[PDB]
Design a protein around this motif. Structure first.
Motif, PDB file in Angstrom:
ATOM      1  N   UNK A 164       0.989  -1.250  -0.129  1.00 24.13           N
ATOM      2  CA  UNK A 164      -0.078   0.012   0.025  1.00 24.13           C
ATOM      3  C   UNK A 164       0.913   1.300   0.019  1.00 24.13           C
ATOM      4  N   UNK A 165       0.147   2.326  -0.748  1.00 22.65           N
ATOM      5  CA  UNK A 165       1.261   3.554  -0.792  1.00 22.65           C
ATOM      6  C   UNK A 165       0.897   3.785   0.845  1.00 22.65           C
ATOM      7  N   UNK A 166       2.355   4.659   1.100  1.00 25.40           N
ATOM      8  CA  UNK A 166       2.645   5.023   2.546  1.00 25.40           C
ATOM      9  C   UNK A 166       1.878   6.346   2.748  1.00 25.40           C
ATOM     10  N   UNK A 167       0.767   6.317   3.759  1.00 26.05           N
ATOM     11  CA  UNK A 167       0.049   7.623   3.781  1.00 26.05           C
ATOM     12  C   UNK A 167       1.005   8.633   4.447  1.00 26.05           C
ATOM     13  N   UNK A 168       0.604   9.827   4.232  1.00 29.24           N
ATOM     14  CA  UNK A 168       1.473  11.160   4.510  1.00 29.24           C
ATOM     15  C   UNK A 168       0.400  12.227   5.204  1.00 29.24           C
TER      16      UNK A 168
END
Length: 47
Positions: A7-11
């Motif tokens: 999953x794309x790492x949330x920022x």
RNA sequence: CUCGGGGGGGCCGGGCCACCCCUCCCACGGCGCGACCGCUGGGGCGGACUGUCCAGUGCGCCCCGGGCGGGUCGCGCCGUC
């Protein structure tokens, strides 16, 4: 070979609003009062 | 006390309530104050919006104050065959 999804790492982001919120009852109510005053004021000015 | 028969007072200890003073806790009701919850004009900053006069309306944070409502708690005083 590798079908797993990373999953794309949330920022975290700065709180930004991109659309208007609802007008409150007071804002809607005051808008009508301003419109009414504007109409009568224009009528008196014309005469 | 009354004619052996008959009628009464009793016998001595303890606690309690009345009398006069203080005194602990609880319950209920009232009064006052205080704390916190808690119903609800002013100021400052930020921002969003509205009006066919520059005026006006919410929202976020902070700082005050009034009207005066209730609740929880804690006090002080009063009342209770």
């Amino acid at each position: 070979e590798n079908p797993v999804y990373e999953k794309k790492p949330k920022r975290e982001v700065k709180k930004k609003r991109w659309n208007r919120p609802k007008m409150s009852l007071a804002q809607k109510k005051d808008r009508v009062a301003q419109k009414k005053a504007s109409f009568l004021r224009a009528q008196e000015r014309a005469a």
